[PDB]
Amino acid sequence: MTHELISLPYAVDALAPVISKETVEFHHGKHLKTYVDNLNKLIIGTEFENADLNTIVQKSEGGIFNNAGQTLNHNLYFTQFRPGKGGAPKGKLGEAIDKQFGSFEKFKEEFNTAGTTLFGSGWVWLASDANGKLSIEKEPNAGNPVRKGLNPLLGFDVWEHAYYLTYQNRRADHLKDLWSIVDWDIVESRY
Amino acid sequence: MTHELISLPYAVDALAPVISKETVEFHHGKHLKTYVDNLNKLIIGTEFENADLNTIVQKSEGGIFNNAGQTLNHNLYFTQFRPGKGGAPKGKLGEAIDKQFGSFEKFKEEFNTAGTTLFGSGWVWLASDANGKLSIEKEPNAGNPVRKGLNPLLGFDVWEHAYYLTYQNRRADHLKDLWSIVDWDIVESRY
Amino acid sequence: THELISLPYAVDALAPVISKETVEFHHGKHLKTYVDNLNKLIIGTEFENADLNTIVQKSEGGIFNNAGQTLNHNLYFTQFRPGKGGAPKGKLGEAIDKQFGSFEKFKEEFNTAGTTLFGSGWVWLASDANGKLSIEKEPNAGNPVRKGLNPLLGFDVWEHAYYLTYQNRRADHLKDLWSIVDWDIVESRY
Amino acid sequence: MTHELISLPYAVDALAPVISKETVEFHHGKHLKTYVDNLNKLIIGTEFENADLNTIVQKSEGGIFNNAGQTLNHNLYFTQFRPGKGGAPKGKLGEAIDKQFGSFEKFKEEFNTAGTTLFGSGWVWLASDANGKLSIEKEPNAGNPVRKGLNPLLGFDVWEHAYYLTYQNRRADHLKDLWSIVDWDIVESRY
Ligand SMILES: [Fe+3]
Ligand SMILES: [Fe+3]
Ligand SMILES: [Fe+3]
Ligand SMILES: [Fe+3]
């Protein structure tokens, strides 16, 4: 079986200046493309050869997991952003964030802090369980909450390639700027 | 007339990371407010009391010119930017830039270079004469091309307060980044 | 070949008037550049082996900009010391007093001059041959030695000198500077 | 004790193009400075306030360890390079390599492979034990062989910030180019 490189729902420069055209090209066209190609080559002749992506992330180990996890991570990452959006979440998700975190602003800083204190490469995930309970997951390297049976809602990539060309060492500034391009209509639909 | 501090056509954090929320707050909320306040003070009891800003900039000198010039400069500066824009110019302007500079990319390095070589405080302006001929004007301090009878189209502020909080001494990096927030629709409309 | 002067104090010694981050950028990046540029530009010119003062006195354009800024900062950074301030004594103390009326009066005029300078520049306290004092407003890279005067005390009003801590509050910064001025060093220049 | 930011034994642009002037400015001037500043702040009032770097790396945990390990890692990193060097090792070290590795070229490929396959952020270290035995240690994130009682000889930084501005995703290319700027006289002196 074969996994495909996702098509971006927007132009490569649609997310500037928070995510530059150059970053999109490298992040999507080089990094993600590599994870997809690796995954495809590594699952041949294995029990994951014909499994759906989520099943692979939940059960694989080693190189297969690293590539499958990164593939799922970026697929979700790239499709949750849209220019001219941002703002705050409404409806179901919006209510749960206030109840569990007190307010959207309070949740944002906890999210940002989680992403900033994650040492090295990794991901910060907003996830939920079957009951709708929200949690903030700090996932080192290729980690994803589906491995814990959780539902990944919003993920911020803190691997340096996600922001280096524009922010260099200023990861904190990048995380606070990312909220401006989050399409909550897409995120709410994952809840 | 009473010159007013213009309202921003976007949110204070809309131009991050090229121009951060803090910088917009000080640049617009503090520096520009001071120029407007000083201008309103100095023209009292003078031939400029009831003149429009453009006339003041073309005919004044000394303190009146310094504040009038900075007011006009910043009013044009802040209104020319937008997030999710950038790119290249189109229409006659884009056409004129190619015809007169060879290409947009050549225009940029030439504009960037003028900005980086300006010693001290100043502005670099893309201006047009009555026939649509373009020129790059290096303006020390509060200078503006309208003083030469030209039409100011796009201006980059290289006073250190425009980029210090984020870039410190790296003026060149700041200039390179500015292109990503230029709303060419607005600039084309001035042509 | 000119060198980047060595600070006679720790980088965080002048905080908060001049923060640790500012000293690092002002001295470690800005001054270094003016020096690296001055060395480069004078190579193969009549100023290749002249002394800094003569360069600032005869230079033009690029060479002068970097020369004036190097001399300017050299006197700037070396005129401060933590826990000093106060008032001037001896010769200079009497001069200022006689020529300005009082020290408070002088500080006032000096602050106004610095707040008034539009754009980038330096406000300088200079002295002529007969020890007559004058407050010189120098745009950009200017320095009183150009006019054949003796530079005693200079405040850097380029925005990079205070923006990290004071942003647009230049006046507040100039009022605070007096607290870290080492008058003993200023007297030694008069 | 207050740890200092090490002085570079060469110009900031001496290592270009393998390590650009900008990468040195960001890598040494921003990343290393932050790790040092952070370390100095965290150790105050702790059992490590007066301890030497190696001791801190060997016994500390959490944030102190992360910053101390990165400080030690980078100090050895920046000092082992010199323009106009490279080549192969000689002496007791050049001998030990050829011996337990086959040849310098065979050690190189092995080292390169270690660095390219380390997933996420980390360091690849050539370490020596008490008897002079050589080993290639893959250290994730802030790891250093000193923590294991070994002697660090040559370390390549594979955190993306070490090569992204110039190589972007091409880590393998960067590791290949690193050999050209290694000063074996320095390395040899550590054995
Ligand atoms: Fe990524
Ligand atoms: Fe400005
Ligand atoms: Fe300065
Ligand atoms: Fe590093």
PDB file of N, CA and C in Angstrom, chain C residues 27-64:
ATOM      1  N   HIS C  27      28.303  47.840  22.626  1.00  0.00           N
ATOM      2  CA  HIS C  27      29.750  47.632  22.566  1.00  0.00           C
ATOM      3  C   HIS C  27      30.130  46.428  21.714  1.00  0.00           C
ATOM      4  N   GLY C  28      29.498  45.290  21.995  1.00  0.00           N
ATOM      5  CA  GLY C  28      29.803  44.061  21.286  1.00  0.00           C
ATOM      6  C   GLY C  28      29.427  43.955  19.821  1.00  0.00           C
ATOM      7  N   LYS C  29      28.483  44.770  19.360  1.00  0.00           N
ATOM      8  CA  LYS C  29      28.074  44.703  17.961  1.00  0.00           C
ATOM      9  C   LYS C  29      28.236  46.031  17.235  1.00  0.00           C
ATOM     10  N   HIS C  30      27.614  47.082  17.760  1.00  0.00           N
ATOM     11  CA  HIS C  30      27.705  48.396  17.127  1.00  0.00           C
ATOM     12  C   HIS C  30      29.138  48.937  17.069  1.00  0.00           C
ATOM     13  N   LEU C  31      29.804  49.031  18.220  1.00  0.00           N
ATOM     14  CA  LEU C  31      31.171  49.550  18.261  1.00  0.00           C
ATOM     15  C   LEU C  31      32.136  48.693  17.464  1.00  0.00           C
ATOM     16  N   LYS C  32      31.994  47.379  17.575  1.00  0.00           N
ATOM     17  CA  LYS C  32      32.867  46.481  16.841  1.00  0.00           C
ATOM     18  C   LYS C  32      32.762  46.753  15.345  1.00  0.00           C
ATOM     19  N   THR C  33      31.544  46.990  14.875  1.00  0.00           N
ATOM     20  CA  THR C  33      31.329  47.253  13.463  1.00  0.00           C
ATOM     21  C   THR C  33      32.020  48.542  13.022  1.00  0.00           C
ATOM     22  N   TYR C  34      31.871  49.603  13.807  1.00  0.00           N
ATOM     23  CA  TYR C  34      32.495  50.871  13.455  1.00  0.00           C
ATOM     24  C   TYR C  34      34.008  50.692  13.376  1.00  0.00           C
ATOM     25  N   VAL C  35      34.541  49.840  14.245  1.00  0.00           N
ATOM     26  CA  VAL C  35      35.974  49.584  14.268  1.00  0.00           C
ATOM     27  C   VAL C  35      36.384  48.742  13.065  1.00  0.00           C
ATOM     28  N   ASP C  36      35.696  47.627  12.858  1.00  0.00           N
ATOM     29  CA  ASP C  36      36.010  46.752  11.741  1.00  0.00           C
ATOM     30  C   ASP C  36      35.915  47.517  10.422  1.00  0.00           C
ATOM     31  N   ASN C  37      34.965  48.444  10.351  1.00  0.00           N
ATOM     32  CA  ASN C  37      34.769  49.243   9.150  1.00  0.00           C
ATOM     33  C   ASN C  37      35.844  50.321   8.998  1.00  0.00           C
ATOM     34  N   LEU C  38      36.269  50.903  10.119  1.00  0.00           N
ATOM     35  CA  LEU C  38      37.289  51.952  10.089  1.00  0.00           C
ATOM     36  C   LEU C  38      38.628  51.380   9.628  1.00  0.00           C
ATOM     37  N   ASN C  39      38.979  50.225  10.183  1.00  0.00           N
ATOM     38  CA  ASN C  39      40.222  49.544   9.818  1.00  0.00           C
ATOM     39  C   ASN C  39      40.235  49.242   8.328  1.00  0.00           C
ATOM     40  N   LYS C  40      39.128  48.678   7.843  1.00  0.00           N
ATOM     41  CA  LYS C  40      38.967  48.318   6.433  1.00  0.00           C
ATOM     42  C   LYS C  40      39.057  49.528   5.483  1.00  0.00           C
ATOM     43  N   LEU C  41      38.302  50.580   5.789  1.00  0.00           N
ATOM     44  CA  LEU C  41      38.272  51.763   4.929  1.00  0.00           C
ATOM     45  C   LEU C  41      39.557  52.593   4.847  1.00  0.00           C
ATOM     46  N   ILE C  42      40.369  52.574   5.900  1.00  0.00           N
ATOM     47  CA  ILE C  42      41.592  53.373   5.892  1.00  0.00           C
ATOM     48  C   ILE C  42      42.775  52.686   5.224  1.00  0.00           C
ATOM     49  N   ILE C  43      42.615  51.408   4.897  1.00  0.00           N
ATOM     50  CA  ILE C  43      43.683  50.653   4.250  1.00  0.00           C
ATOM     51  C   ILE C  43      43.998  51.213   2.860  1.00  0.00           C
ATOM     52  N   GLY C  44      45.257  51.588   2.651  1.00  0.00           N
ATOM     53  CA  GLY C  44      45.667  52.120   1.362  1.00  0.00           C
ATOM     54  C   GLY C  44      45.349  53.588   1.184  1.00  0.00           C
ATOM     55  N   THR C  45      45.015  54.262   2.278  1.00  0.00           N
ATOM     56  CA  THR C  45      44.693  55.682   2.222  1.00  0.00           C
ATOM     57  C   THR C  45      45.681  56.476   3.059  1.00  0.00           C
ATOM     58  N   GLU C  46      45.641  57.791   2.904  1.00  0.00           N
ATOM     59  CA  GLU C  46      46.526  58.673   3.650  1.00  0.00           C
ATOM     60  C   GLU C  46      46.267  58.600   5.150  1.00  0.00           C
ATOM     61  N   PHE C  47      45.184  57.932   5.547  1.00  0.00           N
ATOM     62  CA  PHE C  47      44.843  57.818   6.965  1.00  0.00           C
ATOM     63  C   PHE C  47      45.206  56.460   7.527  1.00  0.00           C
ATOM     64  N   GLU C  48      45.872  55.639   6.727  1.00  0.00           N
ATOM     65  CA  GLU C  48      46.224  54.302   7.177  1.00  0.00           C
ATOM     66  C   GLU C  48      47.018  54.223   8.476  1.00  0.00           C
ATOM     67  N   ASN C  49      47.893  55.190   8.712  1.00  0.00           N
ATOM     68  CA  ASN C  49      48.686  55.170   9.935  1.00  0.00           C
ATOM     69  C   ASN C  49      48.599  56.462  10.738  1.00  0.00           C
ATOM     70  N   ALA C  50      47.526  57.222  10.536  1.00  0.00           N
ATOM     71  CA  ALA C  50      47.332  58.466  11.273  1.00  0.00           C
ATOM     72  C   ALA C  50      46.666  58.109  12.596  1.00  0.00           C
ATOM     73  N   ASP C  51      46.690  59.025  13.558  1.00  0.00           N
ATOM     74  CA  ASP C  51      46.047  58.723  14.831  1.00  0.00           C
ATOM     75  C   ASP C  51      44.556  59.080  14.719  1.00  0.00           C
ATOM     76  N   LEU C  52      43.716  58.330  15.439  1.00  0.00           N
ATOM     77  CA  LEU C  52      42.271  58.549  15.443  1.00  0.00           C
ATOM     78  C   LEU C  52      41.839  60.021  15.431  1.00  0.00           C
ATOM     79  N   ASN C  53      42.381  60.824  16.348  1.00  0.00           N
ATOM     80  CA  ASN C  53      42.043  62.249  16.412  1.00  0.00           C
ATOM     81  C   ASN C  53      42.243  62.974  15.086  1.00  0.00           C
ATOM     82  N   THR C  54      43.376  62.718  14.441  1.00  0.00           N
ATOM     83  CA  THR C  54      43.663  63.356  13.165  1.00  0.00           C
ATOM     84  C   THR C  54      42.687  62.883  12.090  1.00  0.00           C
ATOM     85  N   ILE C  55      42.311  61.609  12.157  1.00  0.00           N
ATOM     86  CA  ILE C  55      41.368  61.041  11.199  1.00  0.00           C
ATOM     87  C   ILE C  55      40.024  61.752  11.322  1.00  0.00           C
ATOM     88  N   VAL C  56      39.496  61.809  12.540  1.00  0.00           N
ATOM     89  CA  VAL C  56      38.220  62.475  12.783  1.00  0.00           C
ATOM     90  C   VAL C  56      38.309  63.947  12.391  1.00  0.00           C
ATOM     91  N   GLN C  57      39.524  64.478  12.408  1.00  0.00           N
ATOM     92  CA  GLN C  57      39.762  65.876  12.078  1.00  0.00           C
ATOM     93  C   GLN C  57      39.876  66.165  10.585  1.00  0.00           C
ATOM     94  N   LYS C  58      40.322  65.179   9.813  1.00  0.00           N
ATOM     95  CA  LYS C  58      40.508  65.366   8.380  1.00  0.00           C
ATOM     96  C   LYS C  58      39.653  64.476   7.484  1.00  0.00           C
ATOM     97  N   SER C  59      39.099  63.408   8.049  1.00  0.00           N
ATOM     98  CA  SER C  59      38.274  62.462   7.295  1.00  0.00           C
ATOM     99  C   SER C  59      37.013  63.032   6.653  1.00  0.00           C
ATOM    100  N   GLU C  60      36.448  62.249   5.739  1.00  0.00           N
ATOM    101  CA  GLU C  60      35.225  62.611   5.035  1.00  0.00           C
ATOM    102  C   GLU C  60      34.451  61.340   4.695  1.00  0.00           C
ATOM    103  N   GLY C  61      33.135  61.468   4.584  1.00  0.00           N
ATOM    104  CA  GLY C  61      32.301  60.328   4.243  1.00  0.00           C
ATOM    105  C   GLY C  61      32.401  59.094   5.122  1.00  0.00           C
ATOM    106  N   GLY C  62      32.425  57.930   4.479  1.00  0.00           N
ATOM    107  CA  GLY C  62      32.490  56.664   5.188  1.00  0.00           C
ATOM    108  C   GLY C  62      33.564  56.576   6.250  1.00  0.00           C
ATOM    109  N   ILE C  63      34.769  57.013   5.910  1.00  0.00           N
ATOM    110  CA  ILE C  63      35.873  56.971   6.854  1.00  0.00           C
ATOM    111  C   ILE C  63      35.555  57.830   8.077  1.00  0.00           C
ATOM    112  N   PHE C  64      34.995  59.013   7.854  1.00  0.00           N
ATOM    113  CA  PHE C  64      34.677  59.886   8.975  1.00  0.00           C
ATOM    114  C   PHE C  64      33.561  59.322   9.851  1.00  0.00           C
TER     115      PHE C  64
END
